[PDB]
Design a binder for this molecule. Sequence first.
Ligand SMILES: OC[C@H]1O[C@@H](O[C@H]2[C@H](O)[C@@H](O)[C@H](O)O[C@@H]2CO)[C@H](O)[C@@H](O)[C@H]1O
Length: 622
Amino acid sequence: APGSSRVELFKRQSSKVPFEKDGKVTERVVHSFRLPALVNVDGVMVAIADARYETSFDNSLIDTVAKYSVDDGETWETQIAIKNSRASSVSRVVDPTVIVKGNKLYVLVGSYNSSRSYWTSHGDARDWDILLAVGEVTKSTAGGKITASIKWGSPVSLKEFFPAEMEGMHTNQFLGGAGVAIVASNGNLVYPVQVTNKKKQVFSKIFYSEDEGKTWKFGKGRSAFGCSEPVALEWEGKLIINTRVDYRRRLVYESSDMGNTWLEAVGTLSRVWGPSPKSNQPGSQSSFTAVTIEGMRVMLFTHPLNFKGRWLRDRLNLWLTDNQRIYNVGQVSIGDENSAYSSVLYKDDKLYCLHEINSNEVYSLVFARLVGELRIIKSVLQSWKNWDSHLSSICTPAGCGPAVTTVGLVGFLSHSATKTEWEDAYRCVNASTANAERVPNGLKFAGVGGGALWPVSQQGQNQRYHFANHAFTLVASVTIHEVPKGASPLLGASLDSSGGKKLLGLSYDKRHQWQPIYGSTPVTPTGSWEMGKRYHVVLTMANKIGSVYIDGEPLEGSGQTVVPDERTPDISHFYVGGYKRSGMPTDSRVTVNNVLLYNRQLNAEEIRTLFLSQDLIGTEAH
Ligand SMILES: OC[C@H]1O[C@@H](O[C@H]2[C@H](O)[C@@H](O)[C@H](O)O[C@@H]2CO)[C@H](O)[C@@H](O)[C@H]1O
């Protein structure tokens, strides 16, 4: 990332902290630093973490360290925010989870006295407490300089707020999800927490306070079992709770009622992010925040790619999303270093990341100035803004008719293309092409193997288009140049690598009829088409039903089940203008322009507007 730089701020086996025991304080070298949380309190940067004094092993001696800086991270002061009980050589305060409100740092930690096993394996709660400490940040301008100070109060146990029973089950322990939590728009302090029951299942809840931390409540709902280390933000009046699932894809939920109800975010972010290339390795803590960049509300998300496997968790990656498009900003860590946990802060229009580096299970936290990354982010955000503005600004055929909708518009294939790719105007997922000739606002295809392939599950580890398994609208303009020998494809969602098994699609045949394909149902040819005429094609799928529209009108027989109510589809890719498979004997001679993908089923007016504005939406002229 050109322009970016970093320092080893919390340096393993080197950085010292003020270790207090029985009224005596000694500057003490720390073996490992883990669990970064990086925040802004009134212009003061504060970096909170675990100081694992003797080893990186989880069940060992740990205090919560804080560093703070008034100069954007050039210099820092160092404190212990929270000390462990000092009961034993493995006493520890763990998983520090931070909320900023006003001048206050709320830090929630589990506290353990003597156990040498990880908390989820405990059969009881005898070794556990849950503590809240408050740090009060003040600033001084005495002497013509800015000086900050943080006064940490004594921790208070919140155990009294943990019910012995929850929706049936009996509770054992809970911890914060680590990293940075939030103040909701209603002022509530909101911690996503990870909780165990007596069956040793782990699940996520919302733990919240309506009275500045004095009392706490749990929402009655929960994630699925197996969801740990939850991280949350508030988006459009809802909490978005992004969870770690060891050995599986991350589950993401939305709750509008402080955790009383949880709905999997299948239409947006759930199941997008895999913990390793084959999504069969441990997960991670993640930074997940909502921020406003160049006037646009967006979300930033970090997770390692974990090519190495196990808990090594190399290749920390950064992602940008507006809850519609999902852009890979790139790799924050360096080379193949192990770099699991992280915390991203956007402050005074500068981007920073405090994150782990691990060699031989000795961990430092580096403090990175993400200059290259913010440059890419602003570029991408300007492209999103530009194209949304382009589409929204179009005076559609009436005065002007209804505006073309950009709500839920995820991808758009128009004029830009290279020799082997059709480029997404939204810059997230290009389509691969074969036997494609560039024409205004699209591509012309010919010959066996021709077409374009827009990957869905084929995206691999990180599946930005997973939403399509639940609902989508796929729109294009198509022109047929040659009468085919038999039924030939134009547009569709494939369930397998070849395109032979379809969820929903549209073909055309030698008798000048359309052949809409509804899942595995026998195909009934219908309607009529003419060579050389530009047709508007809309495929919609929602609530397991698929519809095919030509020139804004449903084909006779549209609105059929395409998904057996038991299973959830796993779309491989969308195919456009052919299958893009030389193993498929069809030869589609067609031009396709302006392909739009939405994460929802468009309504009647929206479809009609798109049909009527086909000649106006191309990116060529702009
Ligand atoms: O490697 C650091 C990492 O260890 C994880 O714990 C693993 C451990 O790595 C593995 O050797 C052992 O067999 O199983 C453990 C989990 O039961 C921790 O989860 C993680 O926090 C790190 O401490």
